[PDB]
Structures are given as C-alpha cells and as structure tokens.
Amino acid sequence: TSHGLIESQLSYYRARASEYDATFVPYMDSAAPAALERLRAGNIRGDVLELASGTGYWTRHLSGLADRVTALDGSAEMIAEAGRHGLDNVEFRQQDLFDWTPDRQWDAVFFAHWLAHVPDDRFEAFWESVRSAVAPGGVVEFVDVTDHERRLEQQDDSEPEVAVRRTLQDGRSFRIVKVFRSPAELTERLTALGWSCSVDEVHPGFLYATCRP
Amino acid sequence: TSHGLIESQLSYYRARASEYDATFVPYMDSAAPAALERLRAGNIRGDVLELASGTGYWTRHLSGLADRVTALDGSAEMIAEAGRHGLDNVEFRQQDLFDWTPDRQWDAVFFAHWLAHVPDDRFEAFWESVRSAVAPGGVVEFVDVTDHERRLEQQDDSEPEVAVRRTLQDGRSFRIVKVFRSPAELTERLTALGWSCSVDEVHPGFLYATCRP
Numbered sequence: 442t443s444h445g446l447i448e449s450q451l452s453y454y455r456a457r458a459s460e461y462d463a464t465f466v467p468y469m470d471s472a473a474p475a476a477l478e479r480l481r482a483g484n485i486r487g488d489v490l491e492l493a494s495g496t497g498y499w500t501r502h503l504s505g506l507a508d509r510v511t512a513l514d515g516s517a518e519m520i521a522e523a524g525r526h527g528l529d530n531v532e533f534r535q536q537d538l539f540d541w542t543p544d545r546q547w548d549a550v551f552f553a554h555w556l557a558h559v560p561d562d563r564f565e566a567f568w569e570s571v572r573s574a575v576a577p578g579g580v581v582e583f584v585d586v587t588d589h590e591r592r593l594e595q596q597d598d599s600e601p602e603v604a605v606r607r608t609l610q611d612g613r614s615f616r617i618v619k620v621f622r623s624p625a626e627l628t629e630r631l632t633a634l635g636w637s638c639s640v641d642e643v644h645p646g647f648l649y650a651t652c653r654p
Numbered sequence: 655t656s657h658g659l660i661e662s663q664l665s666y667y668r669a670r671a672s673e674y675d676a677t678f679v680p681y682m683d684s685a686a687p688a689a690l691e692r693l694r695a696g697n698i699r700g701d702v703l704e705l706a707s708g709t710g711y712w713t714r715h716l717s718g719l720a721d722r723v724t725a726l727d728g729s730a731e732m733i734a735e736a737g738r739h740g741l742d743n744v745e746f747r748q749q750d751l752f753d754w755t756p757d758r759q760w761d762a763v764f765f766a767h768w769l770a771h772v773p774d775d776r777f778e779a780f781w782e783s784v785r786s787a788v789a790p791g792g793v794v795e796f797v798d799v800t801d802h803e804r805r806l807e808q809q810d811d812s813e814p815e816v817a818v819r820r821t822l823q824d825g826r827s828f829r830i831v832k833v834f835r836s837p838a839e840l841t842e843r844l845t846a847l848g849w850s851c852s853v854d855e856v857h858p859g860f861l862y863a864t865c866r867p
C-alpha cells in the first residue's frame with residue numbers, strides 16, 4: 442500500500458467534510474440500534490478516546506456516556522463540522538493516525554468505520570499504538586462493515602485489491618482503502634497480536650467489537 | 655475487461671483441470687442439497703444444454719434427469735476429466751462461450767458457477783446467445799455464488815474490481831473474473847433484457863435462478 446493511497450484517502454475525507462452527513466456511511470442508519478445495544482453495554486465510561494471521529498456522529502453518543510471525550514481526526518474540516526454539535530465534554534485534536542503514539546491512557550477507546558481504512562500492512566502498528574492508549578482494566582470497542590465468514594474463501598483472492606474509487610458531486614475523484622473483514626478474521630488476527638476479542642455481526646453487513654489488551 | 659483476463663481465466667481452468675476435483679468450488683458441497691431441491695423441481699428435462707460443464711459434477715445430475723445432455727466447455731482437459739463418469743446420454747463439445755452462437759435449441763439450459771466468470775461488458779451478448787439456445791417453453795437455470803443485497807453500496811466503488819488472483823498447486827498464478835451478483839441485481843438486469851426471473855439465495859453464499867425467455 443503506497444503512501445499515495447493513504448494521502449488520497451485522507452484528502453478524500455478532508456474534501457468530503459462539508460457534505461458528509463448528507464450521505465453518511467451506507468446503511469449505518471439500519472444498523473445503529475443494534476450497535477447502540479453494544480455501545481451502551483457499559484464499557485464506554487470515564488475518560489474516553491475516540492479515533493477518526495469525523496463529523497461526530499458517534500462522538501455525540503460517547504459524550505452522553507463518558508465523563509470526558511478526547512476525539513482525534515486527521516481532517517481539521519471534520520473537526521470543525523463536529524464542533525457544531527457543541528459537546529461540552531469533548532476535546533478535539535487533529536492527528537494522523539498512521540503516525541501516532543499516545544502519551545497518556547484512557548478508560549476506553551472507540552472508533553467507528555475506521556479500521557476498514559487501515560490497510561493490512563499498517564494494521565499491526567496502528568494496533569500497537571491503540572494498545573498503549575488503553576488504561577488498566579480498559580477496553581477497545583469499534584464498529585465497522587463486515588462479510589459473512591465464507592465469502593473470503595468463495596472469492597479465493599491471493600492479492601486482494603484494497604482500493605475503492607469514490608467520487609464527490611463536484612467531480613474530483615479519490616481512491617480509498619476499503620477492507621471488509623469478517624468477525625472470524627479480525628478475531629484470529631488480533632488474538633495473534635495478544636488481544637482477547639468478542640467480535641460480532643450485529644446487523645447484516647456490520648460488526649461490533651470489544652477488545653481487551 | 656481486456657481479452658487477456660478472459661484468456662487467463664480459460665488457461666487457469668485448463669491447467670486446473672487435472673486437480674480441479676481436488677478442491678472443487680468452495681462450500682458447494684455444503685449448498686448442494688439446497689441447490690438440488692431446485693434442480694429437481696422438474697424443469698431439467700428432455701434435451702438439456704449445459705454450459706461450462708468442467709469435470710461434470712452437475713453433468714452427472716443432468717444426465718439422470720434428461721433424455722440427452724449436450725455439455726459445452728472451453729477446455730478439452732475439463733472435457734477429458736468429465737468423460738471418466740461414463741455418462742451414456744451426454745455429448746461433450748469444446749466451445750469458447752465468449753464466441754458462441756448456437757445453431758440448435760434445447761428444452762433447458764443449465765450452468766453452475768459460470769455466470770460469475772462473465773464480466774459486465776460481456777454479460778448482454780452472453781445472455782443473447784443463451785436466449786437463442788432456449789426452445790419455446792424452456793427455461794434457463796443456474797447456480798452461482800451470491801452476496802447480500804447491500805454489500806455493493808457499503809463498498810461504494812465506481813471502478814469495481816472485476817478480477818481475483820488464484821494460485822495452483824505447482825505455484826502458477828492466474829487472474830480470473832469473479833463478479834458476485836445479488837439475487838436482486840441479477841433479477842433487475844435480466845428483467846431489463848426480457849427475462850422473467852426467480853433468483854433465490856438457497857444456502858448462505860449461494861443462489862439458484864430460474865429464468866424464462
């Protein structure tokens with residue numbers, strides 16, 4: 442995965458910031474009540490770190506559950522959008538998550554629709570930084586798109602193309618990372634990295650994960 | 655879709671023909687009884703045409719249900735393997751299905767796991783020839799892989815990846831066409847081309863279609 446794909450994906454979200462909520466993540470609206478049952482399970486409490494907060498759709502929920510939220514995003518434009526919710530207990534910080542080392546620790550870490558934008562060759566290092574961010578007794582939780590277990594094997598592709606072309610309505614076009622991972626695949630891969638994981642398809646096409654370091 | 659992908663796909667199966675039954679189609683063995691409930695619904699009868707017969711897994715069944723089977727495959731190697739079943743009422747013919755205009759008509763046309771190897775730019779001409787091959791009162795039935803209705807939109811790719819990369823036993827690597835199409839997508843496209851279609855997911859990961867001209 443070339444650095445061009447990382448930058449073109451960032452630039453994409455930097456440019457999509459104005460119009461983002463006009464479209465949102467496809468069918469996330471269908472899946473939100475199922476994901477919310479997991480989000481409110483009680484692990485999102487105290488000092489909470491959110492990764493890739495975007496326009497702050499999840500940040501609102503976390504704000505309601507946490508004492509304080511630290512919300513990180515690569516796009517200052519996303520941050521400005523998120524500011525319009527006026528959430529008293531949220532601090533925003535701009536941060537390239539592919540070049541990030543936490544300095545403190547938090548009770549819980551959350552991200553929605555971020556991991557699928559992390560290519561396999563960046564997976565492990567992202568997850569090492571996530572590890573250091575988790576306070577003792579803390580949890581990592583995330584939401585993402587998913588596949589049924591067997592699709593990967595039916596497809597049987599030895600060089601999966603991670604890239605997807607997206608095009609705004611102004612006409613400028615971008616390639617982004619889009620890696621659909623099954624609950625089984627993420628569990629295998631994060632177990633190998635030392636996490637204990639409960640990863641579940643909560644609604645067709647969507648997963649929710651709880652990971653303990 | 656370049657002619658080189660088409661050729662690569664056919665050479666992949668030519669080379670695979672001797673070891674094909676050793677791996678077969680992933681999870682088809684799980685889905686076979688469900689698919690058989692449809693195959694045995696009574697439309698496979700009289701003179702049937704089979705497209706992309708391979709090693710004759712389905713030809714065996716077609717042979718038991720029909721009077722006569724004409725089985726077409728691009729690979730003589732595949733045809734040689736299929737001959738080992740010693741089916742009395744079956745005639746094999748080598749035929750490149752992307753360069754094919756039937757001269758005869760049949761009571762039924764069947765194919766299993768062929769349509770997913772027909773790229774979008776070849777789909778219409780393929781169905782045009784299939785239309786020529788169906789006798790009045792006849793049907794086309796087919797088995798293939800499937801996706802959940804919503805995946806396509808969740809991915810949201812404007813240049814969808816038509817291709818996957820396979821590796822043989824001996825290490826030889828080949829790109830092939832692998833287009834997963836939902837029942838609704840297939841129904842909508844085939845209806846636009848004048849077919850009435852009953853397309854159903856009969857087992858997770860697998861669909862069965864009955865199409866009428």
Ligand SMILES: C[S@+](CC[C@H](N)C(=O)[O-])C[C@H]1O[C@@H](n2cnc3c(N)ncnc32)[C@H](O)[C@@H]1O
Nearest residue numbers: 451454493494495514515516536537538553554
């Ligand atoms: C649409 S997805 C996240 C969805 C939305 N932010 C949410 O949490 O529901 C992309 C988000 O990740 C952010 N992002 C993309 N590349 C990044 C990077 N390299 N470093 C940090 N954030 C990045 C984008 O700014 C965008 O907000």
Ligand SMILES: C[S@+](CC[C@H](N)C(=O)[O-])C[C@H]1O[C@@H](n2cnc3c(N)ncnc32)[C@H](O)[C@@H]1O
Nearest residue numbers: 664667706707708709727728729749750751766
């Ligand atoms: C994975 S399938 C095998 C079929 C298997 N017997 C079945 O029906 O379940 C692909 C089959 O299509 C054939 N094929 C690939 N390209 C072709 C082409 N251009 N024309 C005719 N047959 C082709 C291959 O020879 C192979 O037998």
